[PDB]
# Entry
Amino acid sequence: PNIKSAIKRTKTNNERRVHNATIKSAMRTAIKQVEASVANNEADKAKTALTEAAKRIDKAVKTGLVHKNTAARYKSRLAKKVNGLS
RNA sequence: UCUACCCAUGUCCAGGGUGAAGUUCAGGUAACACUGAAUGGAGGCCCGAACCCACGCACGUUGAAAAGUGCGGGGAUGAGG
RNA sequence: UAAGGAACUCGGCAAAAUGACCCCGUAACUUCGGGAGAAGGGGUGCUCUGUUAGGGUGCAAGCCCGAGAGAGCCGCAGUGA
RNA sequence: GUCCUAAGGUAGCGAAAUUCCUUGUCGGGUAAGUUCCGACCCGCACGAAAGGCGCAACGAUCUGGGCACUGUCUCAACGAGA
RNA sequence: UUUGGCACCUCGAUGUCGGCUCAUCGCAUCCUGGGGCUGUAGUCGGUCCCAAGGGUUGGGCUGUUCGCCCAUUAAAGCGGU
RNA sequence: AGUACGAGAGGACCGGGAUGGACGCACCGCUGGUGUACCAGUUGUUCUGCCAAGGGCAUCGCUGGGUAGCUAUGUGCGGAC
RNA sequence: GGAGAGUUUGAUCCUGGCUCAGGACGAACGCUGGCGGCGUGCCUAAUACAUGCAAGUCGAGCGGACAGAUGGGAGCUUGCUCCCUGAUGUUAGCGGCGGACGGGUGAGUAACACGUGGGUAACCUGCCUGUAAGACUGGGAUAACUCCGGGAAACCGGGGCUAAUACCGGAUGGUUGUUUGAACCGCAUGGUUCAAACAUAAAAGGUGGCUUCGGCUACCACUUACAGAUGGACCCGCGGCGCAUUAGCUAGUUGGUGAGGUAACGGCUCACCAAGGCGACGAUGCGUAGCCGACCUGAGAGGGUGAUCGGCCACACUGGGACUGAGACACGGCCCAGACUCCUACGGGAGGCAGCAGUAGGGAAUCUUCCGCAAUGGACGAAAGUCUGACGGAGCAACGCCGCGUGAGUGAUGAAGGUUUUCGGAUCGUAAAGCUCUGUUGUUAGGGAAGAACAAGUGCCGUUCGAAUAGGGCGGUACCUUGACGGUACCUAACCAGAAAGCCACGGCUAACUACGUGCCAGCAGCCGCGGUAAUACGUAGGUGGCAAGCGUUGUCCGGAAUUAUUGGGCGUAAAGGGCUCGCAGGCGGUUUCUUAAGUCUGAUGUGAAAGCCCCCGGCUCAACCGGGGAGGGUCAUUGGAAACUGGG
RNA sequence: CCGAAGGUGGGACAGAUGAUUGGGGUGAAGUCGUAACAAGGUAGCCGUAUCGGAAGGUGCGGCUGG
RNA sequence: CGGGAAGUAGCUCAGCUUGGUAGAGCACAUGGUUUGGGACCAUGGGGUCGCAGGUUCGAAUCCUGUCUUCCCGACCA
RNA sequence: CCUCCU
Ligand SMILES: [K+]
Ligand SMILES: [K+]
Ligand SMILES: [K+]
Ligand SMILES: [K+]
Ligand SMILES: [Mg+2]
Ligand SMILES: [Mg+2]
Ligand SMILES: [Mg+2]
Ligand SMILES: [Mg+2]
Ligand SMILES: [Mg+2]
Ligand SMILES: [Mg+2]
Ligand SMILES: [Mg+2]
Ligand SMILES: [Mg+2]
Ligand SMILES: [Mg+2]
Ligand SMILES: [Mg+2]
Ligand SMILES: [Mg+2]
Ligand SMILES: [Mg+2]
Ligand SMILES: [Mg+2]
Ligand SMILES: [Mg+2]
Ligand SMILES: [Mg+2]
Ligand SMILES: [Mg+2]
Ligand SMILES: [Mg+2]
Ligand SMILES: [Mg+2]
Ligand SMILES: [Mg+2]
Ligand SMILES: [Mg+2]
Ligand SMILES: [Mg+2]
Ligand SMILES: [Mg+2]
Ligand SMILES: [Mg+2]
Ligand SMILES: [Mg+2]
Ligand SMILES: [Mg+2]
Ligand SMILES: [Mg+2]
Ligand SMILES: [Mg+2]
Ligand SMILES: [Mg+2]
# Structure
């Protein structure tokens, strides 16, 4: 940039994204664990995965990444699959 | 007995493609036109071996041969061989 | 056969290049048939899914034909001559 | 106007498979084009079934220009066989 | 070296234009070397003299020789065989 | 030496030095070319009984490389004094 | 609430064009030019840009340098030095908010972009202000600073550290999801309210004062729910461009089903199915264009425009993409590509004037490289304040509109003085000659604006919190303070009406003539037309109606033009009946009665911003201007009637 | 995987320009004839054909606006 | 390159071949004409013969050079 | 058969 607070906002936002991507990745990985568990026929693990998923989901909401409606949509999708197993 | 043309009588032409007329059905109109689809299988039609021809080049030129060979080339259901 | 690429030559003569199948796509002009394989592009091996879908034959068993997909694997290159 | 004729060449095309002069002139294409294409018309010496002018398709036809392609060439080198 | 004149060799054959390949010779010198004169200030030139050692381009058009043109070059010589 | 010369424009001789073009000689260390008794990949079919691994033929089957040798477009040197 | 005129003929009536008088403007060009007050000023090249400036702030988040010194210390030339970290200050760097606003331009867009229409049951909604729970308990890293290595460099990578109101762990959290049922229902998809379980999810403290040093506070402020509000998103009816010498278009195209994505509904994306969708009521294509409030014109219907000013939209050197978040898929960011500018010792960096000024270029043509945040509004902050080319001012330019003027008034020589000539004149002309009276303004010196509300700082008092008298905040209440313009507007007072009149037109339309010089020449011309040796329209010279420092000329639009005719025209001979049928669609349709109620009509309710123009219109001395209450505004909803007529049975 | 820019290709459309060529308009006093307007000296005009320097002529059919 | 032919007023041409004379048409100017024109009629002005040299008593004329413009010719089998 | 321009 050619402004002081622009150069800060350049340097800031890069460092934010890295940290932010972590939590999305963590969430998406935690979502994959639940999805993977449906194939293997193992509800007991899927519940314990869904908690860790739900934690990682809601951490992104706090930071300001996943919208409350976005989170609402995900936890819906997962819970229907878990109940659809039994 | 070569060759030109003709006459009688035989015979040959691997394969593949294209898709004329007609027909049927559907649409279509007062009738016809006309349209589509399917079917159909025309042609000195197409690509291409055999076969027939002989366009280009090279070679050969006291030749392997008094007209050929090699590599390409043209026709190849026809006014065909 | 380096680099170049018709500068050669009367003249690209000769040679090189193109070349199969499937798919996409294809202008002027036209006698409405054509032009047309116009042009220009893409795909092409092998393995598994797979004795695939589907088809022929058969009472079946079996034998034969066989797309199109998906996932891979290898090479400089798969109509590998 | 005048002379001559049987009648004086229409349409179309034209430096042409025809044009001597001639590489006509102008334009196009090329760095450069006696060839080629388009124009023009002083047609030496086109011209209407010894047809005129066009024309899709067709051609081992002739001509000019491109892309590709190459030992055709710059300029030649090596290898195989006879 | 031209066009010719003559008709002497060759009509029981002296292949005939241009190009390609290979040159070689002359000098009336295109370039380079050396000079004189200049209407030679310089840089360039002009003109004549000496000099034949070596050098003297690739293309477009045309069968062309020649020529014109493009682009170069120190120069793009003229002739004989 | 922007010296001489010239109003300027321009712009030398003579003398130093560097580096080319064309031409020639040699040579393969380098860059490349070729390299049919080198190495490798690969198609079809056929043979070594079969598998695996190989051989034959298909332009050296084709394709990618390549040693020596021979080579130019490559390198060195020459026409100096 | 609506005016015509000239011009076809020898003359006529008609048809028919042409031209003129009006108004308008972002104007340009001539010639000319005094001042003032409001307004306006790249319409061309969304061309390229030298230079400067246009968004920075919070030290009461922050460790840290670097200062401060109230004091002790301080060797001692009283000259200078100092050793401790004073209250606290300056705040590179970290963290927060803003930077998505404000400002600019209209390139693209024929589209739910816009103007008038819904879900809000398809959404979102930080900040602000309420009502409703909390900041409890885990640490671990990292800038700066330093150490090391780079970079001539520009810029930067490692190492050990340190902080934070930066970040992450865990409990319990009404939100959220899931499930278990209810309650209650709508416009189908449903929605709203309640209860338990399972799962998940919270914070942050920095200031000043008081601590009984247990803590308890309070402005600020961190975090959670139900609100309100605000600003966005999607969807839809209906509207508003040209060309058929553009007739077929489409293949995620049209619908389904499923999956995914999205704040959100949805071919929005994809998989798998079908075969649809659109179009003569104009699809598709091409062209042109931001739309609207409005603006110009007109009796109105209409027509044209969409500079300035307000709203919606779109864009930000060209093009693509996401990140951050409540919110850009960024106007002074980044990532990548491209064309241009800059730097680079060549490895690599930096930027986008459609921000204000300015430059070049283009062009008929459009400003100052200005001063100030005093005012208004922002951002930041608790505040002081800082930043603000937004904004206020000023510069420039007759580019508009208009001021109130540039006097009033007494005064007949009709003088002076003019160009004509029937050698005489006549009009300007009560206007000046000679004045003589007043200060709208200004000719020069003295007074002097308003604009300023203040915000705070301070002093006080009711209220609510307060362990509380702390100590602040919020209602009434003092005191306090600041002006770019600018010593500028406006007043007084002289020198004094001195400084302040103009331009254009004068055949006719449309109120306004003669000498001379040309001689179809030179020239003129909106139209009709003038000039060939007596030119009331040409060259010159002397002479006069409108509006008022300008008005002529050219350009554009509406009018006149009942001249595209719905209002409001035509087709025997002026332009105009298809050569004539058969007919698809379409348009139109006898009489009665019944019924219907789409059209038709009608009542009631909601919106159609602000400005502008306008009805009453007021205020500012009237103005060249600002406020309120109305009205218009709809082929518009929703609902209740009426039912003759048109339509349906 | 998608994907801007770029590359390649064959078409579509629009503008500019082009040797030359075609009519058209305009232009005080050019050349040729005299076609039309009168029965315009062959009544004219419409469609069509053909011919001719040029207006035009001629055929066929039509019209009266003879 | 060689050979021809031109070159005369503003423009187009005679005169050149046989030496003595500068003409013609159009344009230009003036007059006539007419209201004024146009056309027509009459009357003028305007070169020194592309440039230079030569021969001659004397050169547009004959000879040469030069410049400009045309025309013709220019292997060979 | 024709009858210059204003
Ligand atoms: K050639
Ligand atoms: K041919
Ligand atoms: K002989
Ligand atoms: K070698
Ligand atoms: Mg055949
Ligand atoms: Mg064949
Ligand atoms: Mg053969
Ligand atoms: Mg080669
Ligand atoms: Mg090569
Ligand atoms: Mg050649
Ligand atoms: Mg050659
Ligand atoms: Mg060949
Ligand atoms: Mg030529
Ligand atoms: Mg060639
Ligand atoms: Mg003949
Ligand atoms: Mg004959
Ligand atoms: Mg003899
Ligand atoms: Mg003999
Ligand atoms: Mg000699
Ligand atoms: Mg070796
Ligand atoms: Mg080698
Ligand atoms: Mg094997
Ligand atoms: Mg064998
Ligand atoms: Mg064999
Ligand atoms: Mg636009
Ligand atoms: Mg009207
Ligand atoms: Mg008539
Ligand atoms: Mg009529
Ligand atoms: Mg009729
Ligand atoms: Mg007549
Ligand atoms: Mg007659
Ligand atoms: Mg005749």
Notes: The radius of gyration of chain A is 17 Å. The longest helix of chain A spans residues 4-40. Chain A has three helices and no strands.
